């Protein structure tokens, strides 16, 4: 028996997208929900929710334990894009060929749509049905650290301050460490939801950190080249050593080999 990532991604992406859709039921001021759904339901790879389910499932958890957190992660990812596209930031006029949130609804609504998604992410983790509350709190804490000044937002800030040819290699590492912070918390949250012991959470953390780095190397070899691609390989190789789980680890090993 051999493992097809394309099938897995297809199966998972389907279940994730119905969950995303169900999470935002349209009421009161319909424009806010519309603006949220517009960015959240515009398709994509959905790697972040999938990493979460992967990690949870590998450790013995179920889709039902991780699904809310998985949607939460995608909501956070979405709102970072909504905010990043704003004129005051990257000033993007379209994304995946479709116009960006603010171009459809206005900068004001876009800002609020992002805010709504960010807070809803936490609300949603906390409404997770069948999981001890202690685990959910840990996810919420880690999610907080990943998204804020010590993570995603932190990275975006350093990124903006460097947006300079003389930029150091360590300034490149802090910038890309924060997109890894989102990525790390995907597998970390999954593990915690499953009831993983701290050593496992660290195992996954380091796996996530390594993958995160590798992604930005190859995206740079489109930050680079013959030795750049060597590093990306050493790192994905170290990661793909979570052999202790054997067959259960196929999705994560597969997913890693995005080179």
Author numbering: 9 to 171, 174 to 232, 258 to 259, 263 to 297
In the authors' words:
In this study, we report the first crystal structure of GGPPS (CrtE) from a cyanobacterium – in our case the model strain Synechococcus sp. PCC 7002 (Syn7002). CrtE, in common with other trans-prenyltransferases, contains the two highly conserved FARM and SARM regions and contains a two amino-acid insertion (Pro-95 and Ala-96) in the FARM characteristic of a Type-II GGPPS. In the case of photosynthetic organisms, most photosynthesis-related metabolites such as carotenoids and the side chains of chlorophylls and plastoquinones are all derived from GGPP, synthesized by GGPPS. Syn7002 GGPPS is a homodimer and its three-dimensional structure is most similar to the large subunit of heterodimeric A. thaliana GGPPS1.
We obtained CrtE crystals in two different crystallization conditions. The crystal formed in 0.2 M ammonium acetate, 0.1 M sodium acetate (pH 4.6) and 30% (w/v) PEG 4000 had 6 copies in the asymmetric unit, and the crystal generated in 0.1 M sodium citrate (pH 5.5) and 20% (w/v) PEG 3000 contained 2 copies in the asymmetric unit. In both cases CrtE crystals had the same space group - P212121. Each CrtE monomer is composed of 14 α-helices (A to L, and α1) joined by connecting loops. The two aspartate-rich motifs, FARM and SARM, are located in helix D and H, respectively, forming a large catalytic cavity for allyl substrate binding. α-helices (D, E, F1, and F2) form a large tunnel-shaped pocket which is hypothesized to be involved in prenyl chain elongation according to previous structural studies. The inner surface of the pocket is filled with hydrophobic amino acids (Ala-80, Ile-84, Met-87, Leu-126, Phe-130, Leu-151, Val-155, and Leu-160) which, based on previous studies on prenyltransferase enzymes, are predicted to determine the chain length of the final product. In addition, residues in helices E, F1 and F2 at the homodimer interface are non-polar.
